[PDB]
Write a protein that binds this ligand. Sequence first.
Ligand SMILES: *[C@@H]1O[C@H](CO)[C@@H](O[C@@H]2O[C@H](CO)[C@@H](O[C@@H]3O[C@H](CO[C@H]4O[C@H](CO[C@H]5O[C@H](CO)[C@@H](O)[C@H](O)[C@@H]5O)[C@@H](O)[C@H](O[C@H]5O[C@H](CO)[C@@H](O)[C@H](O)[C@@H]5O[C@H]5O[C@H](CO)[C@@H](O)[C@H](O)[C@@H]5O)[C@@H]4O)[C@@H](O)[C@H](O[C@H]4O[C@H](CO)[C@@H](O)[C@H](O)[C@@H]4O)[C@@H]3O)[C@H](O)[C@H]2NC(C)=O)[C@H](O)[C@H]1NC(C)=O
Ligand SMILES: *[C@@H]1O[C@H](CO)[C@@H](O[C@@H]2O[C@H](CO)[C@@H](O[C@@H]3O[C@H](CO[C@H]4O[C@H](CO[C@H]5O[C@H](CO)[C@@H](O)[C@H](O)[C@@H]5O)[C@@H](O)[C@H](O[C@H]5O[C@H](CO)[C@@H](O)[C@H](O)[C@@H]5O[C@H]5O[C@H](CO)[C@@H](O)[C@H](O)[C@@H]5O)[C@@H]4O)[C@@H](O)[C@H](O[C@H]4O[C@H](CO)[C@@H](O)[C@H](O)[C@@H]4O)[C@@H]3O)[C@H](O)[C@H]2NC(C)=O)[C@H](O)[C@H]1NC(C)=O
Ligand SMILES: *[C@@H]1O[C@H](CO)[C@@H](O[C@@H]2O[C@H](CO)[C@@H](O[C@@H]3O[C@H](CO[C@H]4O[C@H](CO)[C@@H](O)[C@H](O[C@H]5O[C@H](CO)[C@@H](O)[C@H](O)[C@@H]5O)[C@@H]4O)[C@@H](O)[C@H](O[C@H]4O[C@H](CO)[C@@H](O)[C@H](O)[C@@H]4O)[C@@H]3O)[C@H](O)[C@H]2NC(C)=O)[C@H](O)[C@H]1NC(C)=O
Ligand SMILES: *[C@@H]1O[C@H](CO)[C@@H](O[C@@H]2O[C@H](CO)[C@@H](O[C@@H]3O[C@H](CO[C@H]4O[C@H](CO)[C@@H](O)[C@H](O[C@H]5O[C@H](CO)[C@@H](O)[C@H](O)[C@@H]5O)[C@@H]4O)[C@@H](O)[C@H](O[C@H]4O[C@H](CO)[C@@H](O)[C@H](O)[C@@H]4O)[C@@H]3O)[C@H](O)[C@H]2NC(C)=O)[C@H](O)[C@H]1NC(C)=O
Ligand SMILES: *[C@@H]1O[C@H](CO)[C@@H](O[C@@H]2O[C@H](CO)[C@@H](O[C@@H]3O[C@H](CO[C@H]4O[C@H](CO)[C@@H](O)[C@H](O)[C@@H]4O)[C@@H](O)[C@H](O)[C@@H]3O)[C@H](O)[C@H]2NC(C)=O)[C@H](O)[C@H]1NC(C)=O
Ligand SMILES: CCCCCCCCCCCCCCCCCCCC(=O)O[C@H](COC(=O)CCCCCCCCCCCCCC)COP(=O)(O)OCCN
Ligand SMILES: CCCCCCCCCCCCCCCCCCCC(=O)O[C@H](COC(=O)CCCCCCCCCCCCCC)COP(=O)(O)OCCN
Ligand SMILES: *[C@@H]1O[C@H](CO)[C@@H](O[C@@H]2O[C@H](CO)[C@@H](O)[C@H](O)[C@H]2NC(C)=O)[C@H](O)[C@H]1NC(C)=O
Ligand SMILES: *[C@@H]1O[C@H](CO)[C@@H](O[C@@H]2O[C@H](CO)[C@@H](O)[C@H](O)[C@H]2NC(C)=O)[C@H](O)[C@H]1NC(C)=O
Ligand SMILES: CC(C)CCC[C@@H](C)[C@H]1CC[C@H]2[C@@H]3CC=C4C[C@@H](O)CC[C@]4(C)[C@H]3CC[C@]12C
Ligand SMILES: CC(C)CCC[C@@H](C)[C@H]1CC[C@H]2[C@@H]3CC=C4C[C@@H](O)CC[C@]4(C)[C@H]3CC[C@]12C
Lengths: 58, 191, 92, 50, 17, 11
Amino acid sequence: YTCCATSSRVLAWIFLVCILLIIVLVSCFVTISRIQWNKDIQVLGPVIDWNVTQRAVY
Amino acid sequence: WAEAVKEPFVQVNPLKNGSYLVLASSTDCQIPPYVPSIVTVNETTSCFGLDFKRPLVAEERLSFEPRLPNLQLRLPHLVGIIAKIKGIKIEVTSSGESIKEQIERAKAELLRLDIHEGDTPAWIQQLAAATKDVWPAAASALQGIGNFLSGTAQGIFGTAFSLLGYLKPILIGVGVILLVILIFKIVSWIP
Amino acid sequence: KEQIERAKAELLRLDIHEGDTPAWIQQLAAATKDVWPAAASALQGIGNFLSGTAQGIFGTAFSLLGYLKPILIGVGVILLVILIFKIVSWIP
Amino acid sequence: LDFKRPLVAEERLSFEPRLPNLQLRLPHLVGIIAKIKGIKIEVTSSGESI
Amino acid sequence: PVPKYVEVNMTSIPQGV
Amino acid sequence: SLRMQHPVPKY
Ligand SMILES: *[C@@H]1O[C@H](CO)[C@@H](O[C@@H]2O[C@H](CO)[C@@H](O[C@@H]3O[C@H](CO[C@H]4O[C@H](CO[C@H]5O[C@H](CO)[C@@H](O)[C@H](O)[C@@H]5O)[C@@H](O)[C@H](O[C@H]5O[C@H](CO)[C@@H](O)[C@H](O)[C@@H]5O[C@H]5O[C@H](CO)[C@@H](O)[C@H](O)[C@@H]5O)[C@@H]4O)[C@@H](O)[C@H](O[C@H]4O[C@H](CO)[C@@H](O)[C@H](O)[C@@H]4O)[C@@H]3O)[C@H](O)[C@H]2NC(C)=O)[C@H](O)[C@H]1NC(C)=O
Ligand SMILES: *[C@@H]1O[C@H](CO)[C@@H](O[C@@H]2O[C@H](CO)[C@@H](O[C@@H]3O[C@H](CO[C@H]4O[C@H](CO[C@H]5O[C@H](CO)[C@@H](O)[C@H](O)[C@@H]5O)[C@@H](O)[C@H](O[C@H]5O[C@H](CO)[C@@H](O)[C@H](O)[C@@H]5O[C@H]5O[C@H](CO)[C@@H](O)[C@H](O)[C@@H]5O)[C@@H]4O)[C@@H](O)[C@H](O[C@H]4O[C@H](CO)[C@@H](O)[C@H](O)[C@@H]4O)[C@@H]3O)[C@H](O)[C@H]2NC(C)=O)[C@H](O)[C@H]1NC(C)=O
Ligand SMILES: *[C@@H]1O[C@H](CO)[C@@H](O[C@@H]2O[C@H](CO)[C@@H](O[C@@H]3O[C@H](CO[C@H]4O[C@H](CO)[C@@H](O)[C@H](O[C@H]5O[C@H](CO)[C@@H](O)[C@H](O)[C@@H]5O)[C@@H]4O)[C@@H](O)[C@H](O[C@H]4O[C@H](CO)[C@@H](O)[C@H](O)[C@@H]4O)[C@@H]3O)[C@H](O)[C@H]2NC(C)=O)[C@H](O)[C@H]1NC(C)=O
Ligand SMILES: *[C@@H]1O[C@H](CO)[C@@H](O[C@@H]2O[C@H](CO)[C@@H](O[C@@H]3O[C@H](CO[C@H]4O[C@H](CO)[C@@H](O)[C@H](O[C@H]5O[C@H](CO)[C@@H](O)[C@H](O)[C@@H]5O)[C@@H]4O)[C@@H](O)[C@H](O[C@H]4O[C@H](CO)[C@@H](O)[C@H](O)[C@@H]4O)[C@@H]3O)[C@H](O)[C@H]2NC(C)=O)[C@H](O)[C@H]1NC(C)=O
Ligand SMILES: *[C@@H]1O[C@H](CO)[C@@H](O[C@@H]2O[C@H](CO)[C@@H](O[C@@H]3O[C@H](CO[C@H]4O[C@H](CO)[C@@H](O)[C@H](O)[C@@H]4O)[C@@H](O)[C@H](O)[C@@H]3O)[C@H](O)[C@H]2NC(C)=O)[C@H](O)[C@H]1NC(C)=O
Ligand SMILES: CCCCCCCCCCCCCCCCCCCC(=O)O[C@H](COC(=O)CCCCCCCCCCCCCC)COP(=O)(O)OCCN
Ligand SMILES: CCCCCCCCCCCCCCCCCCCC(=O)O[C@H](COC(=O)CCCCCCCCCCCCCC)COP(=O)(O)OCCN
Ligand SMILES: *[C@@H]1O[C@H](CO)[C@@H](O[C@@H]2O[C@H](CO)[C@@H](O)[C@H](O)[C@H]2NC(C)=O)[C@H](O)[C@H]1NC(C)=O
Ligand SMILES: *[C@@H]1O[C@H](CO)[C@@H](O[C@@H]2O[C@H](CO)[C@@H](O)[C@H](O)[C@H]2NC(C)=O)[C@H](O)[C@H]1NC(C)=O
Ligand SMILES: CC(C)CCC[C@@H](C)[C@H]1CC[C@H]2[C@@H]3CC=C4C[C@@H](O)CC[C@]4(C)[C@H]3CC[C@]12C
Ligand SMILES: CC(C)CCC[C@@H](C)[C@H]1CC[C@H]2[C@@H]3CC=C4C[C@@H](O)CC[C@]4(C)[C@H]3CC[C@]12C
């Protein structure tokens, strides 16, 4: 009985901690993925100059 | 002007003097891809599934061919995404534009392609392709977290997250009802 | 009526964003100038404050606090769950 | 407008082409896709997957 | 399998004109 | 300018 009562308590704690970690993992992914997108937009892009000699592959 | 095109792309124009003008998304007969070029061969051969013949010897006369000035041209980093979401041929820069003006041109448009509850995996795969040249370590990570939501199991985690995303307003509503009970139940313990 | 209900949905969905608030606020002013000139002059001012004053540090600060919103809520929720337990574990 | 009865004709040897038939499946919301572009837009290919 | 080669010259088109 | 040497089969 005491073991069953203790089990119920310990289960609920691990079940609570389980969620509160998932809340923190999802929240951190949304923050970082959206910032990186912002930085991707403002990077310097490619240069083209119609030089064939530059693109030779041997 | 920029415009989205279908892969693979191949264009070969036979010129009158016996050379060939080539623009192609893939290599063949040592011709580099993406940059166009005027091509000539000393012996008949098959390139891009057609025959490039050796031209007949010619006699040299006084030329009047023009020689244009060369020109470097800097494009926006995400030119491919800008051309894709218009579905028409669109203006992307000028010959003589500043770095600042060029960027502040599709920035608001591009920022508002934000993450959604309904295509997170398809979005995450775009972010990777966009990040690959900048930060290759991050790209490989993002690509992994992409395939986990899509592939692992029968995509059950994708499903689960998609659904928990759409439920957000209900959850808050319930959450608020719990607080209003908890507060009363707590205040109705204090002597 | 028909003329207005034609680009209204399109136009409404050009909303404020964490990533170009100053550039957005400057559009709102140019849009408001003929309607309410007093408001335009105000909006234009709050525009140049986020862009110009210092090295645009406030623009930066607000942009960053905007992108952090989901993390802050997450932490906020963890504080409540501690506070409630710590409070309930004071009552006799 | 007036649709008139045509004048009787004499039959000669024909050279009219006969194209192959073709079923074509469009997206469910094709009308909303065409409306929010305000130009003529590409929606599928003859031989595209669902 | 015998080594045989064909010569292939290439030139540029300034501005793509 | 760019001179190259394309290999062709001779079986
Ligand atoms: C079918 O038709 C097509 C045409 O539709 C044929 O293709 C054409 O074929 C031509 C051959 O008859 C080619 O011409 C040749 O181009 C060569 C490369 O030219 C470029 O490089 C030169 C050298 O650059 C390096 O070295 C210099 C220092 O010497 C450095 O400064 C550089 O940094 C480099 O390191 C360079 O001089 C050229 O510059 C000129 O052109 C460019 C634009 O292309 C301009 O921006 C330049 O300002 C400059 O033009 C002006 O100045 C020059 C003089 O300096 C004037 O001649 C011009 O009129 C103009 O005012 C290029 O960058 C050349 O090396 C080669 O030279 C030969 O001939 C000269 C005499 O004319 C001799 O002195 C040389 O010794 C050498 O024998 C020649 O000109 C065409 O490029 C080519 N056209 C195209 C579009 O591809 C094709 O063959 C035909 N096919 C058949 C089967 O018939
Ligand atoms: C002004 O000008 C216009 C033209 O611009 C005129 O309109 C044209 O008028 C013509 C009459 O002169 C019409 O032609 C007629 O078409 C009839 C219908 O054809 C279709 O159905 C046929 C039968 O289908 C059923 O039955 C078969 C089994 O028998 C089943 O397999 C089916 O599932 C159906 O249940 C069918 O045979 C036809 O198929 C052919 O055409 C289609 C494309 O349209 C192709 O996909 C097919 O592959 C096939 O074409 C090939 O094979 C046939 C032989 O099988 C060849 O003839 C072709 O060259 C080709 O290789 C259609 O699906 C026909 O029934 C009708 O037949 C009469 O004539 C034949 C001899 O030619 C006799 O044997 C018959 O007994 C019968 O008398 C005839 O062909 C045109 O359709 C019409 N054009 C247009 C574009 O609308 C207009 O009248 C003019 N106005 C004035 C005022 O002058
Ligand atoms: C057309 O041609 C123009 C001119 O070349 C191109 O624009 C220039 O691009 C180059 C290369 O991408 C940029 O070079 C960088 O310069 C910065 C320093 O910039 C500061 O100082 C400049 C002094 O002359 C000044 O002009 C700049 O002013 C502009 O920017 C400010 C701020 O946004 C703005 O307010 C102004 O109105 C101007 O727009 C600015 O004060 C330098 O830090 C960079 O260094 C990097 O690269 C070098 C070399 O590889 C490397 O050693 C360093 O370690 C570092 O990695 C770099 O040199 C230049 O800023 C651009 N100039 C302008 C005016 O925009 C343009 O791209 C061409 N257009 C097309 C379509 O091709
Ligand atoms: C051009 O032509 C193609 C080919 O016909 C058209 O595409 C097909 O459309 C039909 C009709 O809408 C679809 O039929 C359904 O098929 C499923 C079963 O699909 C599964 O098994 C197939 C076995 O051959 C296989 O090809 C499928 O593979 C595709 O899908 C998977 C998963 O997304 C993907 O990973 C693959 O890459 C392929 O794309 C798949 O494994 C069946 O369940 C459906 O049953 C319904 O309909 C029947 C009949 O009315 C009914 O009895 C049932 O009760 C039920 O209501 C249905 O038969 C077919 O899946 C399509 N095939 C492809 C390859 O997409 C296409 O529409 C045409 N294009 C144009 C522009 O017209
Ligand atoms: C691809 O580009 C090559 C250049 O790298 C082309 O080679 C040149 O082609 C011409 C064709 O007229 C050759 O000219 C011949 O020369 C020989 C004798 O060679 C000597 O004299 C020439 C000048 O006449 C001199 O350039 C050489 O250095 C030698 O001293 C004569 O017998 C012929 O009649 C003819 O005049 C050039 O010699 C040759 N140059 C080089 C550097 O090889 C080649 O033709 C191009 N290929 C294709 C497919 O277009
Ligand atoms: C049967 C399977 C087992 C079940 C598993 C689930 C169990 C859960 C247990 C209970 C806890 C519930 C937690 C609630 C989560 C709700 C999700 C909210 C999603 C949401 O609203 O986000 C929106 C869309 O993003 C999204 O929806 C994207 C969400 C994130 C996807 C990525 C997930 C992988 C994370 C990887 C972690 C490691 C990375 C490194 C840290 C955008 O947000 P917004 O609405 O505020 O608008 C911002 C502007 N658009
Ligand atoms: C080093 C410098 C010193 C540090 C200074 C900061 C110190 C802060 C101290 C701690 C307190 C933190 C406060 C948290 C603020 C978080 C900001 C949230 C921003 C946010 O989510 O808003 C989104 C974008 O707007 C925005 O991001 C725009 C935000 C507002 C910009 C204007 C600021 C000037 C205000 C002028 C006041 C006077 C005007 C008259 C009253 C849109 O909102 P949503 O996400 O709900 O989506 C709605 C539909 N898109
Ligand atoms: C076109 O590309 C070629 C190759 O990058 C350039 O030629 C080189 O020029 C440098 C000097 O800037 C030399 O040190 C190399 O030896 C050259 N390489 C070859 C293979 O010739 C050329 O300058 C570029 N630009 C133009 C206008 O032709
Ligand atoms: C076309 O150019 C090629 C260059 O690959 C020539 O190949 C040479 O041919 C001779 C025989 O006359 C060999 O001895 C050389 O070893 C080859 N050179 C190489 C492989 O670099 C070829 O002869 C030319 N063809 C024509 C028809 O003129
Ligand atoms: C499950 C029962 C007990 C209800 C409890 C309420 C919990 C699950 C709800 C209430 C409000 C919710 C948050 C509201 C808003 C956001 C922002 C979003 O971008 C990430 C998730 C996040 C941070 C939610 C996570 C889940 C959350 C904390
Ligand atoms: C700083 C530590 C103690 C965390 C405390 C949480 C605080 C800062 C967080 C939790 C939830 C947050 C709010 C969530 C949503 C919005 C809507 C947005 O349009 C304006 C800001 C506003 C109103 C936020 C302000 C800051 C806020 C109140």
